[PDB]
Design a protein around this ligand. Structure first.
Ligand SMILES: O=P(O)(O)O[C@H]1[C@@H](OP(=O)(O)O)[C@@H](OP(=O)(O)O)[C@@H](OP(=O)(O)O)[C@@H](OP(=O)(O)O)[C@H]1OP(=O)(O)O
Ligand SMILES: [Mg+2]
Ligand SMILES: [Mg+2]
Ligand SMILES: [Mg+2]
Ligand SMILES: [Mg+2]
Ligand SMILES: [Mg+2]
Ligand SMILES: [Zn+2]
Lengths: 49, 46, 34, 287, 222
RNA sequence: CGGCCUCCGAACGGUAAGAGCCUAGCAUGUAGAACUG
RNA sequence: GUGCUCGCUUCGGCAGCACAUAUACUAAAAUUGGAACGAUACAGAGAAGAUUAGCAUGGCCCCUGCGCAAGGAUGACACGCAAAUUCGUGAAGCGUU
């Protein structure tokens, strides 16, 4: 059975650590599934239109 | 106080030529001469 | 990682919300109206 | 945090432990970022310790956030990993390591706080090699202070209050002297770990014979509290046995096997440690 | 000590702040140092406020060391407070000071032109420094939260670092045309070249934008 | 019986940008530390 | 240690009662590692022929500034440009003869 005590923070103490670190953004999420209607390829005519 | 940095267009002073000409907001002057602190420091170190 | 920098604009200001009173148009009268 | 993670040695002896907490106290030399710092009074006149790694930096490899050794066995992490045959891909370079730490904390946030993440469970077959290299009693020399450099030159004029053990300083020619904390955490060329490798390599294990048709195995040091069915139940479902000679005129045994690899399993696992009813048998391949 | 620690932690060895709180360079400074060594209204407003208090403390030190006088001390204090304009040079960092400076002149006028009502002469022997003291104390009431905020931010940026990462800067007066075009040509690229295509391949948006800029030049040239 | 008396100054925009190079500082002050029949 | 025991009990002690209750990044160190925009030198300045004003976009680049303002050579870097694409190469697959 343990006693935790909170150690004083000194008031006149500047920040301690270099916060501004840049890295790329972490990998997103598990991609959703593309629940699309059947897609139609266009005629070459349409394509030229 | 001592007003420390005189305004010595250094392009002019070293190379006799300022690209700004008449409008150089500094002093066109090629005069080498012991400064306001050079002499103080050398003498006291002496 | 919460910084201690700060801003002139984030000083406390306009700290009470003006609630729409009885005469102006409270959601009650909107509950009623025809 | 709720509290630290460290072994019993680092953890203490008195029933009532006293440790002070500072939130965002300093930087885990692993996660590189601010952590909480809990500082524990180790022992009477014994150096106060403090938490020295991020709790996630800890749950990563499952080691001691102060004592730095594993929490199950308590040998160098290089050792314990290899004793599980474990091969971690933790990245090293600055940007690579920061990206790794960030996604690591993201992935550990989805945990329940009970056990380390990942292969740390799918390598939980703690091999008798690790069990045997594991220390037995609390090597509580850890909480003795440094070499009071004053008291090494003479100078420690504070009386007995030399902040450090006023003994003879170790000759740093010893490989057991300068092990960079980051390297010890990365499992990077720990000379103490190589010493544990040499020790667990020279430590006695059962020997293999030459010809495959020597399938008779002599177990030396039997005694007359043993049965043939008990020698069997020692070496019976570990394969199939073909025969057994329990030499009572010499207090030994001999298992002729039906599977060579089964014989190997039983005997090599049994070397000097097959302790049924307390008798130190010796597993070898007979003549 | 504080201000010197600030300089020398910023690694500005070529500047030195002396004991009347003037900042003076010990070399000729190149550009990179001319620039790295610039300071702003926070640093300089503390510097000059400290200089005011140091002048006050040191008049008192002269008196207690015994060189001067009670009357000479009072007159010197009156001076200091009326003449803050030409002793310190704070107005250059908070030009809203001239509120105060005009107030101390006006007091200076009132007090003196009632003080010499009789035989008394119009010379230095007047130290009655209650008024200007009040004035600069109220100035300080006001300036302490401001300087606390500015100096907290200076120190924070000194120890953490400046956050060039998530700045999100306003659109002011010089980015009004540039911004109108960022958003016009974004809107175009949303609008059709990706929501009324069926140019399946790779919708040549980079070229419909070239039309758009030539359509504008042709409108402008008629 | 008449009185009417603004102001006030500093900074940026102006004397390149660089990699290397080398050495003070400045920070650290820690963690650990071995074994048998 | 301070007092009081109607304590022995002399004014020596012994004793009892009370009261009084847990400091501390233990270190004067010894370490150990990076920058000083300074020298050194190399270097060596956007667009279109020349000479030049800028304001932006992008981001594991920053610096000065209290700053969501402004400045730092338009602060620097951004430079192959891929790109399909025009004809053919082929392979896979379905259908006719
Ligand atoms: O420099 P200031 O503080 O503004 O005051 C001085 C000065 O007084 P101090 O130098 O001691 O303050 C004069 O006042 P006297 O001492 O000569 O009485 C003088 O007054 P006049 O100009 O009316 O002669 C005038 O002070 P004031 O503000 O009272 O005028 C002058 O400063 P200014 O001439 O610039 O005002
Ligand atoms: Mg050109
Ligand atoms: Mg700019
Ligand atoms: Mg220009
Ligand atoms: Mg410019
Ligand atoms: Mg730019
Ligand atoms: Zn010129």
């Amino acid at each position: 059975v343990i006693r935790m005590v909170e150690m004083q923070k000194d008031p006149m103490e500047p920040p301690r650590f270099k916060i501004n670190k840049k890295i790329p953004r972490g990998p997103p999420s598990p991609p959703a599934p593309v629940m699309h209607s059947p897609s139609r390829k266009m005629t070459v005519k349409e394509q030229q239109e | 106080r001592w007003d420390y940095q005189p305004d010595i267009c250094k392009d002019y002073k070293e190379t006799g030529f300022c690209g700004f000409g008449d409008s150089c907001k500094f002093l066109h002057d090629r005069s080498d001469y012991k400064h306001g602190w050079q002499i103080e420091r050398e003498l006291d170190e002496g | 990682q919460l910084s201690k920098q700060y801003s002139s604009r984030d000083l406390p200001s306009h700290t009470k919300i003006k609630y729409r009173q009885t005469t102006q148009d409270a959601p009650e009268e909107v509950r009623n109206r025809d | 945090a709720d509290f630290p993670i460290l072994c019993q040695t680092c953890l203490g002896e008195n029933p009532y432990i006293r440790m002070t907490k500072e939130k965002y106290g300093k930087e885990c030399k692993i996660c590189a970022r601010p952590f909480t710092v809990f500082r524990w009074c180790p022992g009477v006149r014994m150096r106060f310790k403090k938490t020295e790694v991020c709790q996630t930096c800890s749950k990563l490899k499952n080691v001691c956030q102060t004592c730095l050794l594993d929490l199950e066995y308590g040998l160098p992490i290089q050792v314990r990993d290899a004793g599980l045959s474990f091969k971690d891909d933790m990245p090293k370079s600055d940007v690579n390591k920061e990206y790794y730490t960030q996604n690591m904390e993201r992935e550990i946030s989805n945990s329940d706080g009970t056990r380390p993440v990942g292969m740390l469970g799918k390598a939980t077959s703690t091999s008798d090699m690790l069990l045997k290299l594991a220390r037995t009693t609390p090597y509580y020399k850890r909480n003795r202070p440094h070499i009071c450099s004053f008291w090494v030159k003479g100078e420690c004029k504070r009386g007995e209050e030399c902040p450090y053990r006023h003994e003879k300083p170790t000759d740093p020619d010893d490989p057991l002297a300068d092990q960079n904390i980051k390297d010890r955490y990365y499992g990077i060329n720990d000379p103490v770990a190589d010493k544990l490798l040499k020790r667990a390599s020279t430590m006695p294990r059962l020997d293999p014979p030459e010809d495959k048709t020597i399938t008779t195995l002599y177990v030396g040091g039997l005694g007359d509290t043993i049965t043939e069915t008990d020698l069997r139940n020692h070496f019976y479902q570990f394969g199939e046995i073909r025969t057994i000679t329990v030499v009572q005129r010499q207090q030994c045994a001999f298992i002729q096997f039906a599977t060579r690899q089964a014989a190997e399993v039983a005997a090599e696992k049994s070397f000097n440690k097959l302790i049924v009813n307390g008798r130190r048998l010796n597993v070898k391949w007979g003549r | 000590n504080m201000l010197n620690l600030l300089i020398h932690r910023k690694n500005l060895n070529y500047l030195h702040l002396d004991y009347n709180f003037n900042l003076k360079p010990v070399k000729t400074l190149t550009t990179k140092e001319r620039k790295k060594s610039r300071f702003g209204n926070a640093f300089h407003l503390c510097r000059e406020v400290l200089r005011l208090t140091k002048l006050v403390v040191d008049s008192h030190v002269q008196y207690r060391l015994g060189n001067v006088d009670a009357f000479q001390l009072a007159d010197g204090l009156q001076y200091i407070f009326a003449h803050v304009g030409q002793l310190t040079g704070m107005y250059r960092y908070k030009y809203k000071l001239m509120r105060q400076i005009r107030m101390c002149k006006d007091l200076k006028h009132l007090i003196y032109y009632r003080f010499n009502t009789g035989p008394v002469g119009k010379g230095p022997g007047c130290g009655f420094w209650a008024a200007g003291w009040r004035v600069w104390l109220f100035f300080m009431r006001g300036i302490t939260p401001l300087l606390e905020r500015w100096l907290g931010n200076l120190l924070a940026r000194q120890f953490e670092g400046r956050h060039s990462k998530g700045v999100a800067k306003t659109v002011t007066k010089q980015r009004v045309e540039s911004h109108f075009d960022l958003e016009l040509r974004a809107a175009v690229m949303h609008d059709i070249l990706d929501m009324m295509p069926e140019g399946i391949k790779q919708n040549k948006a980079r070229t419909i934008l070239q039309h758009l800029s030539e359509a504008w030049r042709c409108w402008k040239a008629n």
